[PDB]
């Protein structure tokens, strides 16, 4: 099968591991990716 142990540098593997373009605030950090300013966030 396909695992999914999102950590940060690659937290999540889909359309976008981290917010596209950038990352807002208050979201809910779930793992920051190399991208400077792009982390695993999900709008409220």
mmCIF file of N, CA, C and O in Angstrom:
data_model
loop_
_atom_site.group_PDB
_atom_site.id
_atom_site.type_symbol
_atom_site.label_atom_id
_atom_site.label_comp_id
_atom_site.label_asym_id
_atom_site.label_seq_id
_atom_site.Cartn_x
_atom_site.Cartn_y
_atom_site.Cartn_z
ATOM 1 N N UNK A 1 0.823 -1.198 0.000
ATOM 2 C CA UNK A 1 0.000 0.000 0.000
ATOM 3 C C UNK A 1 0.866 1.261 0.000
ATOM 4 O O UNK A 1 2.080 1.184 -0.186
ATOM 5 N N UNK A 2 0.209 2.391 0.211
ATOM 6 C CA UNK A 2 0.904 3.668 0.237
ATOM 7 C C UNK A 2 0.851 4.243 1.654
ATOM 8 O O UNK A 2 -0.229 4.506 2.181
ATOM 9 N N UNK A 3 2.031 4.421 2.231
ATOM 10 C CA UNK A 3 2.132 4.961 3.576
ATOM 11 C C UNK A 3 1.852 6.464 3.540
ATOM 12 O O UNK A 3 1.621 7.031 2.473
ATOM 13 N N UNK A 4 1.881 7.068 4.720
ATOM 14 C CA UNK A 4 1.633 8.494 4.837
ATOM 15 C C UNK A 4 1.987 8.955 6.252
ATOM 16 O O UNK A 4 1.106 9.111 7.097
ATOM 17 N N UNK A 5 3.278 9.158 6.468
ATOM 18 C CA UNK A 5 3.759 9.597 7.767
ATOM 19 C C UNK A 5 4.265 11.039 7.689
ATOM 20 O O UNK A 5 5.406 11.321 8.051
ATOM 21 N N UNK A 6 3.390 11.915 7.215
ATOM 22 C CA UNK A 6 3.733 13.320 7.085
ATOM 23 C C UNK A 6 4.561 13.753 8.296
ATOM 24 O O UNK A 6 4.189 13.479 9.436
ATOM 25 N N UNK A 7 5.669 14.420 8.007
ATOM 26 C CA UNK A 7 6.553 14.893 9.059
ATOM 27 C C UNK A 7 6.692 16.415 8.991
ATOM 28 O O UNK A 7 6.350 17.117 9.942
ATOM 29 N N UNK A 8 7.194 16.882 7.858
ATOM 30 C CA UNK A 8 7.383 18.308 7.652
ATOM 31 C C UNK A 8 7.995 18.544 6.270
ATOM 32 O O UNK A 8 7.286 18.882 5.323
ATOM 33 N N UNK A 9 9.304 18.357 6.199
ATOM 34 C CA UNK A 9 10.020 18.546 4.948
ATOM 35 C C UNK A 9 9.212 18.003 3.767
ATOM 36 O O UNK A 9 9.360 18.473 2.641
ATOM 37 N N UNK A 10 8.377 17.019 4.065
ATOM 38 C CA UNK A 10 7.545 16.407 3.043
ATOM 39 C C UNK A 10 6.163 16.055 3.598
ATOM 40 O O UNK A 10 5.405 15.322 2.964
ATOM 41 N N UNK A 11 5.879 16.592 4.775
ATOM 42 C CA UNK A 11 4.602 16.344 5.421
ATOM 43 C C UNK A 11 3.505 16.398 4.356
ATOM 44 O O UNK A 11 3.254 17.450 3.771
ATOM 45 N N UNK A 12 2.881 15.250 4.136
ATOM 46 C CA UNK A 12 1.817 15.153 3.151
ATOM 47 C C UNK A 12 2.405 15.044 1.743
ATOM 48 O O UNK A 12 3.403 15.692 1.431
ATOM 49 N N UNK A 13 1.761 14.219 0.930
ATOM 50 C CA UNK A 13 2.209 14.017 -0.438
ATOM 51 C C UNK A 13 0.993 13.978 -1.366
ATOM 52 O O UNK A 13 0.467 12.906 -1.661
ATOM 53 N N UNK A 14 0.582 15.160 -1.801
ATOM 54 C CA UNK A 14 -0.561 15.273 -2.690
ATOM 55 C C UNK A 14 -0.442 16.535 -3.548
ATOM 56 O O UNK A 14 0.659 17.034 -3.776
ATOM 57 N N UNK A 15 -1.592 17.015 -4.000
ATOM 58 C CA UNK A 15 -1.631 18.209 -4.828
ATOM 59 C C UNK A 15 -0.663 19.271 -4.303
ATOM 60 O O UNK A 15 -0.169 20.098 -5.068
ATOM 61 N N UNK A 16 -0.422 19.215 -3.001
ATOM 62 C CA UNK A 16 0.477 20.163 -2.365
ATOM 63 C C UNK A 16 0.707 19.744 -0.911
ATOM 64 O O UNK A 16 -0.238 19.661 -0.129
ATOM 65 N N UNK A 17 1.968 19.491 -0.594
ATOM 66 C CA UNK A 17 2.335 19.083 0.751
ATOM 67 C C UNK A 17 2.076 20.239 1.719
ATOM 68 O O UNK A 17 1.728 20.018 2.878
ATOM 69 N N UNK A 18 2.256 21.448 1.206
ATOM 70 C CA UNK A 18 2.045 22.641 2.011
ATOM 71 C C UNK A 18 1.174 23.611 1.213
ATOM 72 O O UNK A 18 1.030 23.468 -0.001
ATOM 73 N N UNK A 19 0.613 24.577 1.926
ATOM 74 C CA UNK A 19 -0.241 25.572 1.299
ATOM 75 C C UNK A 19 0.428 26.092 0.024
ATOM 76 O O UNK A 19 1.629 26.350 0.010
ATOM 77 N N UNK A 20 -0.404 26.235 -1.042
ATOM 78 C CA UNK A 20 0.094 26.719 -2.319
ATOM 79 C C UNK A 20 0.347 28.227 -2.271
ATOM 80 O O UNK A 20 -0.417 28.970 -1.657
ATOM 81 N N UNK A 21 1.423 28.636 -2.927
ATOM 82 C CA UNK A 21 1.788 30.041 -2.967
ATOM 83 C C UNK A 21 2.483 30.421 -1.659
ATOM 84 O O UNK A 21 3.606 30.926 -1.671
ATOM 85 N N UNK A 22 1.789 30.164 -0.560
ATOM 86 C CA UNK A 22 2.326 30.473 0.754
ATOM 87 C C UNK A 22 1.534 29.759 1.851
ATOM 88 O O UNK A 22 0.821 28.794 1.580
ATOM 89 N N UNK A 23 1.688 30.259 3.069
ATOM 90 C CA UNK A 23 0.996 29.681 4.208
ATOM 91 C C UNK A 23 0.507 30.821 5.104
ATOM 92 O O UNK A 23 1.277 31.714 5.452
ATOM 93 N N UNK A 24 -0.803 30.752 5.459
ATOM 94 C CA UNK A 24 -1.404 31.768 6.306
ATOM 95 C C UNK A 24 -0.965 31.597 7.762
ATOM 96 O O UNK A 24 0.120 31.083 8.030
ATOM 97 N N UNK A 25 -1.830 32.038 8.663
ATOM 98 C CA UNK A 25 -1.544 31.940 10.085
ATOM 99 C C UNK A 25 -2.769 31.415 10.837
ATOM 100 O O UNK A 25 -3.896 31.544 10.362
ATOM 101 N N UNK A 26 -2.506 30.834 11.998
ATOM 102 C CA UNK A 26 -3.573 30.289 12.821
ATOM 103 C C UNK A 26 -4.070 28.965 12.237
ATOM 104 O O UNK A 26 -4.776 28.213 12.907
ATOM 105 N N UNK A 27 -3.682 28.721 10.994
ATOM 106 C CA UNK A 27 -4.080 27.500 10.312
ATOM 107 C C UNK A 27 -3.996 26.296 11.251
ATOM 108 O O UNK A 27 -4.926 26.028 12.009
ATOM 109 N N UNK A 28 -2.871 25.600 11.170
ATOM 110 C CA UNK A 28 -2.653 24.430 12.004
ATOM 111 C C UNK A 28 -1.442 23.654 11.479
ATOM 112 O O UNK A 28 -1.594 22.574 10.908
ATOM 113 N N UNK A 29 -0.271 24.233 11.690
ATOM 114 C CA UNK A 29 0.963 23.610 11.245
ATOM 115 C C UNK A 29 0.879 22.090 11.406
ATOM 116 O O UNK A 29 0.550 21.595 12.482
ATOM 117 N N UNK A 30 1.182 21.395 10.320
ATOM 118 C CA UNK A 30 1.144 19.942 10.327
ATOM 119 C C UNK A 30 2.459 19.399 9.765
ATOM 120 O O UNK A 30 2.619 18.189 9.609
ATOM 121 N N UNK A 31 3.367 20.319 9.477
ATOM 122 C CA UNK A 31 4.663 19.948 8.936
ATOM 123 C C UNK A 31 5.148 20.979 7.915
ATOM 124 O O UNK A 31 4.510 21.183 6.883
ATOM 125 N N UNK A 32 6.271 21.603 8.239
ATOM 126 C CA UNK A 32 6.848 22.609 7.363
ATOM 127 C C UNK A 32 7.737 21.950 6.306
ATOM 128 O O UNK A 32 8.516 21.051 6.619
ATOM 129 N N UNK A 33 7.590 22.421 5.077
ATOM 130 C CA UNK A 33 8.371 21.889 3.974
ATOM 131 C C UNK A 33 9.515 22.861 3.681
ATOM 132 O O UNK A 33 9.433 24.041 4.019
ATOM 133 N N UNK A 34 10.554 22.331 3.055
ATOM 134 C CA UNK A 34 11.714 23.136 2.713
ATOM 135 C C UNK A 34 11.299 24.557 2.324
ATOM 136 O O UNK A 34 11.890 25.530 2.790
ATOM 137 N N UNK A 35 10.286 24.631 1.474
ATOM 138 C CA UNK A 35 9.784 25.917 1.018
ATOM 139 C C UNK A 35 9.783 26.903 2.188
ATOM 140 O O UNK A 35 9.135 26.664 3.205
ATOM 141 N N UNK A 36 10.536 28.019 1.998
ATOM 142 C CA UNK A 36 10.628 29.044 3.024
ATOM 143 C C UNK A 36 9.345 29.876 3.085
ATOM 144 O O UNK A 36 9.210 30.867 2.368
ATOM 145 N N UNK A 37 8.438 29.444 3.947
ATOM 146 C CA UNK A 37 7.171 30.137 4.111
ATOM 147 C C UNK A 37 5.998 29.233 3.726
ATOM 148 O O UNK A 37 4.853 29.683 3.680
ATOM 149 N N UNK A 38 6.322 27.977 3.459
ATOM 150 C CA UNK A 38 5.310 27.007 3.079
ATOM 151 C C UNK A 38 5.302 25.832 4.060
ATOM 152 O O UNK A 38 6.272 25.081 4.140
ATOM 153 N N UNK A 39 4.197 25.712 4.781
ATOM 154 C CA UNK A 39 4.051 24.641 5.752
ATOM 155 C C UNK A 39 2.699 23.955 5.550
ATOM 156 O O UNK A 39 1.867 24.431 4.778
ATOM 157 N N UNK A 40 2.521 22.848 6.255
ATOM 158 C CA UNK A 40 1.284 22.092 6.162
ATOM 159 C C UNK A 40 0.221 22.804 7.001
ATOM 160 O O UNK A 40 0.151 22.611 8.213
ATOM 161 N N UNK A 41 -0.579 23.613 6.322
ATOM 162 C CA UNK A 41 -1.635 24.355 6.990
ATOM 163 C C UNK A 41 -2.955 24.064 6.273
ATOM 164 O O UNK A 41 -2.962 23.740 5.086
ATOM 165 N N UNK A 42 -4.039 24.188 7.024
ATOM 166 C CA UNK A 42 -5.361 23.942 6.475
ATOM 167 C C UNK A 42 -6.327 25.016 6.981
ATOM 168 O O UNK A 42 -6.619 25.081 8.174
ATOM 169 N N UNK A 43 -6.797 25.830 6.048
ATOM 170 C CA UNK A 43 -7.723 26.898 6.383
ATOM 171 C C UNK A 43 -8.757 26.375 7.382
ATOM 172 O O UNK A 43 -9.016 25.173 7.442
ATOM 173 N N UNK A 44 -9.336 27.326 8.162
ATOM 174 C CA UNK A 44 -10.336 26.974 9.155
ATOM 175 C C UNK A 44 -11.678 26.653 8.492
ATOM 176 O O UNK A 44 -11.714 26.113 7.388
#
